[PDB]
Design an enzyme around this catalytic site. Structure first.
Site, PDB file in Angstrom:
ATOM      1  N   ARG A  84      -5.531  39.070 -50.714  1.00 10.56           N
ATOM      2  CA  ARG A  84      -6.183  37.893 -50.206  1.00 10.56           C
ATOM      3  C   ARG A  84      -6.724  37.676 -48.904  1.00 10.56           C
ATOM      4  O   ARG A  84      -6.448  38.653 -47.997  1.00 10.56           O
ATOM      5  CB  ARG A  84      -4.703  36.954 -50.225  1.00 10.56           C
ATOM      6  CG  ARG A  84      -4.389  36.665 -51.845  1.00 10.56           C
ATOM      7  CD  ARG A  84      -3.247  35.508 -51.362  1.00 10.56           C
ATOM      8  NE  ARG A  84      -2.007  36.095 -51.192  1.00 10.56           N
ATOM      9  CZ  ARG A  84      -1.560  35.980 -49.805  1.00 10.56           C
ATOM     10  NH1 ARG A  84      -2.395  35.396 -49.141  1.00 10.56           N
ATOM     11  NH2 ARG A  84      -0.526  36.664 -49.742  1.00 10.56           N
ATOM     12  N   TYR A 232     -10.431  40.342 -56.728  1.00 13.02           N
ATOM     13  CA  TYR A 232      -9.028  40.841 -56.438  1.00 13.02           C
ATOM     14  C   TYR A 232      -8.238  39.730 -56.791  1.00 13.02           C
ATOM     15  O   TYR A 232      -8.480  38.459 -56.773  1.00 13.02           O
ATOM     16  CB  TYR A 232      -8.589  40.894 -54.846  1.00 13.02           C
ATOM     17  CG  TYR A 232      -7.140  41.066 -54.453  1.00 13.02           C
ATOM     18  CD1 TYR A 232      -6.470  41.984 -54.760  1.00 13.02           C
ATOM     19  CD2 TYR A 232      -6.377  39.893 -54.023  1.00 13.02           C
ATOM     20  CE1 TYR A 232      -4.991  42.006 -54.845  1.00 13.02           C
ATOM     21  CE2 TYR A 232      -4.980  39.917 -54.049  1.00 13.02           C
ATOM     22  CZ  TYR A 232      -4.461  41.109 -54.272  1.00 13.02           C
ATOM     23  OH  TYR A 232      -3.011  41.144 -54.299  1.00 13.02           O
ATOM     24  N   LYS A 241      -2.038  31.760 -57.841  1.00 11.00           N
ATOM     25  CA  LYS A 241      -1.850  31.074 -56.613  1.00 11.00           C
ATOM     26  C   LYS A 241      -2.523  29.799 -56.737  1.00 11.00           C
ATOM     27  O   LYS A 241      -1.994  28.750 -55.835  1.00 11.00           O
ATOM     28  CB  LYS A 241      -2.254  32.191 -55.310  1.00 11.00           C
ATOM     29  CG  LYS A 241      -1.545  33.450 -55.321  1.00 11.00           C
ATOM     30  CD  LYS A 241      -0.188  33.124 -55.346  1.00 11.00           C
ATOM     31  CE  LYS A 241       0.505  34.704 -55.088  1.00 11.00           C
ATOM     32  NZ  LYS A 241       2.084  34.773 -54.859  1.00 11.00           N
ATOM     33  N   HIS A 261       7.096  29.565 -54.465  1.00  9.19           N
ATOM     34  CA  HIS A 261       6.803  31.224 -54.490  1.00  9.19           C
ATOM     35  C   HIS A 261       8.080  31.772 -54.660  1.00  9.19           C
ATOM     36  O   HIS A 261       8.418  32.407 -53.590  1.00  9.19           O
ATOM     37  CB  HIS A 261       5.949  31.600 -53.011  1.00  9.19           C
ATOM     38  CG  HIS A 261       5.586  32.876 -53.077  1.00  9.19           C
ATOM     39  ND1 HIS A 261       5.118  33.426 -51.857  1.00  9.19           N
ATOM     40  CD2 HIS A 261       5.062  33.694 -54.057  1.00  9.19           C
ATOM     41  CE1 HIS A 261       4.856  34.769 -52.082  1.00  9.19           C
ATOM     42  NE2 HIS A 261       4.934  34.779 -53.484  1.00  9.19           N
ATOM     43  N   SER A 283       5.009  37.348 -49.597  1.00  7.66           N
ATOM     44  CA  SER A 283       4.307  38.179 -50.059  1.00  7.66           C
ATOM     45  C   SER A 283       4.571  39.545 -49.775  1.00  7.66           C
ATOM     46  O   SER A 283       4.909  39.850 -48.612  1.00  7.66           O
ATOM     47  CB  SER A 283       2.815  38.112 -50.223  1.00  7.66           C
ATOM     48  OG  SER A 283       2.278  36.708 -50.185  1.00  7.66           O
ATOM     49  N   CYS A 285       7.523  41.197 -49.830  1.00  4.99           N
ATOM     50  CA  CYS A 285       8.749  41.203 -49.148  1.00  4.99           C
ATOM     51  C   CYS A 285      10.110  41.367 -50.143  1.00  4.99           C
ATOM     52  O   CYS A 285      11.192  40.880 -49.793  1.00  4.99           O
ATOM     53  CB  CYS A 285       8.893  39.999 -48.185  1.00  4.99           C
ATOM     54  SG  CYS A 285       7.887  40.215 -46.664  1.00  4.99           S
ATOM     55  N   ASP A 308       7.530  35.539 -59.353  1.00  2.49           N
ATOM     56  CA  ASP A 308       6.412  35.513 -58.364  1.00  2.49           C
ATOM     57  C   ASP A 308       6.512  33.721 -58.059  1.00  2.49           C
ATOM     58  O   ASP A 308       6.362  33.448 -57.033  1.00  2.49           O
ATOM     59  CB  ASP A 308       5.039  35.749 -58.586  1.00  2.49           C
ATOM     60  CG  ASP A 308       4.156  35.734 -57.400  1.00  2.49           C
ATOM     61  OD1 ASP A 308       4.351  36.281 -56.213  1.00  2.49           O
ATOM     62  OD2 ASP A 308       3.113  35.003 -57.519  1.00  2.49           O
ATOM     63  N   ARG A 402      -1.765  47.388 -57.129  1.00  2.30           N
ATOM     64  CA  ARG A 402      -0.963  46.493 -58.015  1.00  2.30           C
ATOM     65  C   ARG A 402      -0.990  47.152 -59.482  1.00  2.30           C
ATOM     66  O   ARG A 402      -1.997  47.586 -59.719  1.00  2.30           O
ATOM     67  CB  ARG A 402      -1.479  44.968 -58.082  1.00  2.30           C
ATOM     68  CG  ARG A 402      -1.581  44.338 -56.866  1.00  2.30           C
ATOM     69  CD  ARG A 402      -0.355  43.542 -56.410  1.00  2.30           C
ATOM     70  NE  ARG A 402      -0.298  42.808 -55.256  1.00  2.30           N
ATOM     71  CZ  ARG A 402       0.537  41.903 -54.568  1.00  2.30           C
ATOM     72  NH1 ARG A 402       1.582  41.727 -55.680  1.00  2.30           N
ATOM     73  NH2 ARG A 402       0.839  41.715 -53.380  1.00  2.30           N
TER      74      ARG A 402
END
Ligand SMILES: Nc1nc2c(ncn2[C@@H]2O[C@H](COP(=O)(O)OP(=O)(O)OP(=O)(O)O)[C@@H](O)[C@H]2O)c(=O)[nH]1
Ligand SMILES: O=C([O-])C(=O)[O-]
Ligand SMILES: [Mn+2]
Ligand SMILES: [Mn+2]
Ligand code: NA
EC number: 4.1.1.32
Length: 619
Positions: A84, A232, A241, A261, A283, A285, A308, A402
């Site tokens: 991002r 991406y 998102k 989130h 993000s 974490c 998520d 990812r």
């Protein structure tokens, strides 16, 4: 019509404009007029469509088939398009203050507002003609279980076949959604990689993108999301998102619910009692690793509802019910191994798309921390498409590489993960990366204290966006990149929950998996050992007298945490609370909230600031 109107039927190579709902047809044809695609492909979501699209990208060199696995694929991007970009992500509203609070000085750290006038200029400099020579794919998608009343439907237009394939995994996609939609409203999502043909600039790694003009915009008053220049997934999978946090959080504020989130998991104790928990970590974490953890404690079971994004609303019985609006997991690869996340390893063995990982010579995947020795002779191609060896200076996989994998393949996916009424949340966990000062687990003193704890979150920068180094950043509620509206108003909305009829307010905890000793070593092993912390939380929700009061909240009593099999953990350093550290912490939070939230900071949050300062002062 006096000519052909906006009839683009001649260019349709799959499906039919006639069979679209009227408003979907108008959205498609309006944007075909603007973007000038060569062809229009109306996605059906079918296996055939999917397999052919993948084999097309393969022949073009846009993706590679990973021959070691059942139907898995690898994309390598331009190194300019890997995560991002918060500085290029904007929300358009009439008034700036509706989008971000006005800070005491300078620009907001809580989002990025762009005026309608500036966005029009930006849009006109990007979209006209942008799809020339390309196919515009029309992706009908549902966020939430298909045909659920809880669901929200969107239509994403994109010129990227990688986005179509990834949307098929990450959402419910295809003709079924058009049939569920009917004449209803839908979120209008427009995406282009911003590389019309013939190419004005050289194509890097066969990855179409436009870094210079990248802009991910949200127009909540027009129900539109418009994203340019990036493939991406955080920037291009517009349901995730963009819609399910940014647009949905504002809808949620207006309609009395929450879009967050957060993972959602179910945890079952050895007596067979089960509870659901939600957790907001920033993000990269730890959400995906917790949501599908394999607990080390005997007799405990974890099941995954989502990793998520959570949509949550109080029911009339006062339960906070949560649903996972996604259909897959878009997970950080590096660090993932049989040791750290065996359920993810199992999920991604088939029907998975990888981005920016390494490839072994026998057609498997590789990344830092995969912890699988390779046979002598097997060689590695890095994510930069170059030969690589374990003693090389740079990683073989991008740090934000990812996997994109169907949630139904998770061996511990929860039986209720597609229940339309959602699962009842009894605990909410906050946390992030703090190498110093913050202990393994504490419990908030009240709902208002817990909202403060969410607001006060700080976490070391990761690779999920553009932030470099190891700076500790504010990331309230793990939402800093994702608020759809003014964060002061968001705090007021969370506080207002305390008054829901019959509300059974979840207990709130804060964790830190990431505290380090003076040598940089993790004090806590984490991953499946985090089940020990979940056990304590579970008992606290049951009302067990297992807690000791401290200035920051409750912590485990001596001997309360099960540390059998972890006799080498330094509990004293790990649970240490320093007056000096916390006096500095509270003043830092005070300055952040007053400066950045300012006129929109709720009284109750300032009061919790004062209370924490006072309790620390009595140390
Ligand atoms: N030391 C340690 N590392 C962890 C732990 N949990 C996850 N990680 C690592 O942190 C990284 C990110 O974890 P994820 O679970 O993918 O993070 P996420 O919160 O799902 O991130 P987004 O998908 O970006 O929202 C991976 O490299 C994990 O291996 C933990 O308990 N301890
Ligand atoms: O991709 C993500 O999930 C993120 O950045 O939080
Ligand atoms: Mn995330
Ligand atoms: Mn994740
Ligand atoms: Na590529």
């Amino acid at each position: 019509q006096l000519h052909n109107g906006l009839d683009f039927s001649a260019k349709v190579i799959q499906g039919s404009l006639d069979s679209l709902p009227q408003e979907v047809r108008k959205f498609v044809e309006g944007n075909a007029q603007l973007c000038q695609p060569e062809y229009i492909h109306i996605c059906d979501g079918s296996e055939e469509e999917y397999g052919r699209l993948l084999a097309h990208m393969q022949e073009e060199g846009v993706i590679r088939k990973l021959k070691k696995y059942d139907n898995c694929w690898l994309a390598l991007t331009d190194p300019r398009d890997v995560a991002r970009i918060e500085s290029k992500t904007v929300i358009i509203t009439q008034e700036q203050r509706d989008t971000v609070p006005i800070p005491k000085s300078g620009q907001s750290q809580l989002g990025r507002w762009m005026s309608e006038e500036d966005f029009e200029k930006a849009f006109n400099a990007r979209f006209p003609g942008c799809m020339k020579g390309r196919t515009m794919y029309v992706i009908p998608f549902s966020m939430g279980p298909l045909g659920s009343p809880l669901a929200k439907i969107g239509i994403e237009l994109t010129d990227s076949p990688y986005v179509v394939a990834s949307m098929r995994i990450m959402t419910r996609m295809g003709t079924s959604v058009l049939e569920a939609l009917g004449d209803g409203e839908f979120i209008k999502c427009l995406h282009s990689v911003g590389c019309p043909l013939p190419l004005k600039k050289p194509l890097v790694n066969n990855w179409a993108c436009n870094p210079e003009l990248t802009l991910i915009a949200h127009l909540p008053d027009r129900r539109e999301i418009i994203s340019f220049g990036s493939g991406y997934g955080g920037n291009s999978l517009l349901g995730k998102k963009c819609f399910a946090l940014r647009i949905a959080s504002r809808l949620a504020k207006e309609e009395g619910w929450l879009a967050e989130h957060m993972l959602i998991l179910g945890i079952t104790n050895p007596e067979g009692k089960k509870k659901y928990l939600a957790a907001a970590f920033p993000s990269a974490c730890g959400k995906t690793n917790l949501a599908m953890m394999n607990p080390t404690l005997p007799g405990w079971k974890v099941e995954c509802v989502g990793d998520d994004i959570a949509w949550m609303k109080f029911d009339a019985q006062g339960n906070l019910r949560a649903i996972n609006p996604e259909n897959g997991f878009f997970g950080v690869a590096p660090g993932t191994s049989v040791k750290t996340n065996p359920n993810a390893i199992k999920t991604i063995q088939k029907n998975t798309i990888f981005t920016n990982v390494a490839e072994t010579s026998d057609g498997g995947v590789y990344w830092e921390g995969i912890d699988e020795p390779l046979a002598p002779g097997v060689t590695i191609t890095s994510w930069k498409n170059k030969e690589w060896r374990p003693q090389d200076e740079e990683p073989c996989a991008h740090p934000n590489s990812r996997f994109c994998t169907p949630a139904s393949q998770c061996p511990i996916i929860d039986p209720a993960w597609e229940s339309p009424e959602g699962v009842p949340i009894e605990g909410i966990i906050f946390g992030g990366r703090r190498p110093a000062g913050v202990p393994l687990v504490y419990e908030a003193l009240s709902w208002q204290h817990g909202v403060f704890v969410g607001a006060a979150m700080r976490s070391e920068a990761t690779a999920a966006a553009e932030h470099k180094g190891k700076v500790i950043m504010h990331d309230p509620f793990a939402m800093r990149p994702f608020f759809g509206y003014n964060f002061g108003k968001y705090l007021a909305h969370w506080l207002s929950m305390a008054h829901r009829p019959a509300a059974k307010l979840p207990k709130i905890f804060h964790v830190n998996w990431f505290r380090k000793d003076k040598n940089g070593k993790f004090l806590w092993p984490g991953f499946g050992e985090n089940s020990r912390v979940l056990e304590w939380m579970f008992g606290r929700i049951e009302g067990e007298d297992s807690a000791k009061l401290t200035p920051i909240g409750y912590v485990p009593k001596e001997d309360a945490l099960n540390l059998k099999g972890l006799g080498d953990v330094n509990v004293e350093e790990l649970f240490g609370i320093s007056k000096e550290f916390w006096e500095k912490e509270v003043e830092e939070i005070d300055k952040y909230l007053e400066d950045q939230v300012n006129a929109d900071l709720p009284y109750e949050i300032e009061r919790e600031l004062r209370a924490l300062k006072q309790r620390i002062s009595q140390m």
